[PDB]
Design a binder for these strands. Structure first.
Lengths: 51, 391, 256
RNA sequence: GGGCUUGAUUAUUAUUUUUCAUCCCGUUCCUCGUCUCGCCAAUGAAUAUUAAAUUUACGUGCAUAUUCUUUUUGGUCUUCGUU
């Protein structure tokens, strides 16, 4: 042995492909869940309302 | 298996045929210096053929020759290897069934054995083969695996080659596939592939066996389990060109042109072009352009790259193929303009066309009583076919 | 200038308190200018002369990122370089407009001149594993693919995205997602516009069709938003970036 | 490693020769702290009620250009001599 992932740049090749590789899409943000919630801040919010 | 990256560059760049000037930093990781004999030297022979020659080749020759006369005298701590080197009889014997290991160890054996190259090359291969099988050994998974690769590499003198052909499709394919958790990664696959190609298609080098064109087609490819991802990464233009040539030479699996077309496009990621054009036009199907291209390509390359060997066969297959397609439907087309192109008088051309027809790939009769080739119907009998299918 | 030398009271550089000085180490202070400029832009839609003012201002803002990186380290590591990558499109379509910007100098550090810029040097020198480009995280690569697609051919951008395996780092980490959508759209446009149908159809159709719903590169806000309420500030901060989009209309023509 | 007459200290006269762990900066090294990520485990089963095992509502009206500048290098103009 041997070796392990040989090319230029830095991380070289990972997985390719063959093309045909339609790639798709991608959307996000549809459900939230937190431990350790943030403040507000109310300052920004007031200013917005004003505008 | 495996390796080396500089060596790899020397390899493929020469094959492509753009230039040689290339380094090959070395030696690495065949070994230093252990079996066989040397990898670099084989590359040098190819380079010499391409284009004269140069300082690296001289260095390689020196490296191969010695270290060292004294070491050569010293080797062997007993108690076989003899009649020149090996003990042919012993090699045969270590299967049937011998498998439960006398003494134990061939650890000191390896130390004594290691020497090498010189190249000497048939004998060297024979010795390696003998070591491989004990079977129980101990020592080792990886060391043995490296050994298998070396056997595959050289010598390609045919009894060694046929043995190695069997070994490649049992061993190497299995090894690449997982499990074992997790091996073998991109470099190993690429290296293995390069060695297989060298061992038979026909670089320059040497290739053809009987027949293992088939082997090349079979492995890179074929869907249970798949890769072809490996072939694509990271950027094997020369290999693709070679595959196109191989497909034409073979002239069928079953599926032939279609498979080749899919492989080829791979539009511009790395794409070498003279063979590729011949195949890509032929499958698509234009008949004027393809016909012209095949002589031009044949004459252009060659180029370097002699062997010659196979390419006469390739030229014949290609001509036959273009014509077979041209006939099929289409007409009900003649025949004088076919004869003029392929280039001898009319009767020789007629018999050549008749040989395409006689393979049961077409239904046709040739009128030599008006010089017309007539095709059947059969492609198309419509209602009748449906009645048969139902009943 | 006169400094270095850094005397009376105490100076360092890290960690304890000095403290905009320390944060200018480092250069988190410049990062806060980068943040606030994006904000201004992000609210006002290009129309009146305000937009001109911010463009001039942004050209000004570049220069510090250059210089600072030749004040080289405290390693630091990062902050100025990160700002440069974000700023980059920069530019561009083939690049136009870098030359006009470039034009006051002193400029210095590494990615300069309309020969470059082009992205690539920063991406190269600032890695993806161990040292750099970490924290955050995967990288420059999306911007390089964007750059490659616009000023080279859509072959290079497609090749880089598929090779680098960067399609599983965009799933979580929400800024990167928008980038992902942005580069996919641009690649399909570039494929159309140097002149084949496929890959252009494949890339572009995939981006579309679905979702409606398109906030995903620009602009636009989903439903609903912006009437409700104080949650506006999620889809108006993820992301969308300004002076880009790249043209609406043009994408639609390409798709249809 | 870089800078630093850093602390002993050649230095400071260019015997400048340092001379080291070190002050200020200093990763790919070892030890420690903490955060992120993770596999499993921990608080939601009625077939009948004696002083009660869990409380409404959560919406209106108002909302800063919030300043002084001395200016000085160009550039649009104007009024004298003279061609």
């Amino acid at each position: 042995m041997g070796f392990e992932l040989p090319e230029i740049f830095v991380n070289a090749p990972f997985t390719w492909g063959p093309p045909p590789s339609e790639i798709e899409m991608d959307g996000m943000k549809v459900r939230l869940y937190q431990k350790t919630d943030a403040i507000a801040p109310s300052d920004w919010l007031e200013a917005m309302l004003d505008q | 298996l495996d390796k080396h990256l500089a060596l790899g560059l020397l390899y493929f760049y020469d094959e492509q045929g753009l230039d040689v000037a290339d380094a090959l930093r070395a030696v690495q990781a065949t070994t230093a210096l252990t079996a066989e004999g040397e990898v670099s030297v084989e590359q040098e022979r190819k380079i010499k053929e391409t284009a004269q020659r140069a300082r690296p080749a001289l260095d390689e020759f020196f490296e191969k020759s010695e270290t060292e006369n004294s070491t050569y005298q010293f080797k062997l701590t007993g108690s076989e290897i003899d009649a020149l080197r090996s003990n042919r009889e012993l090699s045969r014997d270590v299967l049937e069934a011998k498998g439960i290991t006398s003494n134990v160890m061939k650890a000191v054996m390896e130390l004594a054995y290691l020497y090498y190259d010189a190249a000497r090359y048939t004998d060297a291969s024979e010795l390696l083969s003998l070591c491989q099988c004990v079977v129980g050994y101990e020592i080792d998974q990886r060391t043995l695996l490296w050994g298998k690769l070396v056997s595959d590499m050289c010598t390609c003198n045919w009894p060694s080659a046929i043995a190695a052909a069997e070994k490649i499709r049992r061993q190497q394919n299995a090894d690449v596939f997982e499990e074992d958790i997790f091996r073998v990664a991109n470099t190993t696959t690429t290296r293995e592939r390069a060695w297989l190609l060298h061992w038979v298609l026909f670089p320059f080098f040497k290739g053809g066996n009987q027949y293992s064109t088939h082997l090349l087609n079979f492995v890179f490819d074929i869907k249970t389990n798949f890769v072809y991802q490996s072939v694509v990464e990271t950027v094997c233009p020369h290999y693709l060109r070679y595959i196109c040539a191989a497909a034409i030479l073979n002239k069928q699996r079953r599926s032939a042109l279609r498979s080749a077309a899919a492989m080829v496009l791979n539009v511009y990621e790395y794409s070498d072009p003279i063979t590729q054009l011949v195949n890509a036009i032929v499958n698509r199907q234009s008949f004027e352009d393809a016909l012209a291209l095949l002589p031009e390509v044949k004459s252009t390359a060659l180029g370097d790259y002699f062997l010659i060997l196979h390419a006469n066969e390739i030229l014949e297959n290609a001509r036959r193929l273009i014509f077979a397609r041209y006939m099929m439907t289409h007409g009900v087309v003649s025949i004088p303009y076919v004869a003029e192109k392929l280039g001898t008088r009319t009767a020789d051309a007629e018999v050549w066309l008749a040989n395409l027809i006689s393979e049961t790939k077409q239904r046709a009769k040739i009128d030599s009583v008006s010089e017309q080739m007539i095709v059947g119907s059969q492609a198309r009998s419509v209602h009748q076919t449906v009645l048969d299918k139902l009943e | 200038e006169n400094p270095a030398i850094a005397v009376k009271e105490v100076f360092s550089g890290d960690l304890t308190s000095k403290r905009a000085v320390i944060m200018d180490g480092l250069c988190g202070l410049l990062q806060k200018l980068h943040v606030h400029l994006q904000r201004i832009a992000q609210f006002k839609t290009g129309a009146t002369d305000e937009y001109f003012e911010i463009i001039h201002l942004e050209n000004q803002l570049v220069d510090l990122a250059d210089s600072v990186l030749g004040y080289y380290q405290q390693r630091k590591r990062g902050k100025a370089i990160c700002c440069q990558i974000l700023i980059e499109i920069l530019g561009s379509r083939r690049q136009q407009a870098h030359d006009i910007l470039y034009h006051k100098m002193t400029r210095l550090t590494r990615n300069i001149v309309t020969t470059s810029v082009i992205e690539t040097v920063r991406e190269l020198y600032q890695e993806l594993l161990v040292i750099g480009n970490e924290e955050a995280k995967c990288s420059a690569l999306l911007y390089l693919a964007y750059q490659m697609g616009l000023e080279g051919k859509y072959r290079d951008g497609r090749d880089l995205v598929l090779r680098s395996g960067v399609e599983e780092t965009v799933e979580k980490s929400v800024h990167l997602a928008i980038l992902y959508n942005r580069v996919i759209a641009q690649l399909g446009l570039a494929s159309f516009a140097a002149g084949d149908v496929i890959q252009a159809y494949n890339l572009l159709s995939s981006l579309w069709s679905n979702r409606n719903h398109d906030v995903l590169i620009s602009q636009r806000m989903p439903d609903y938003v912006k009437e409700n309420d104080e949650e506006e500030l999620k889809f108006r901060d993820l992301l969308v970036p300004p002076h880009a989009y790249i043209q609406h209309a043009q994408l639609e023509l390409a798709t249809m």
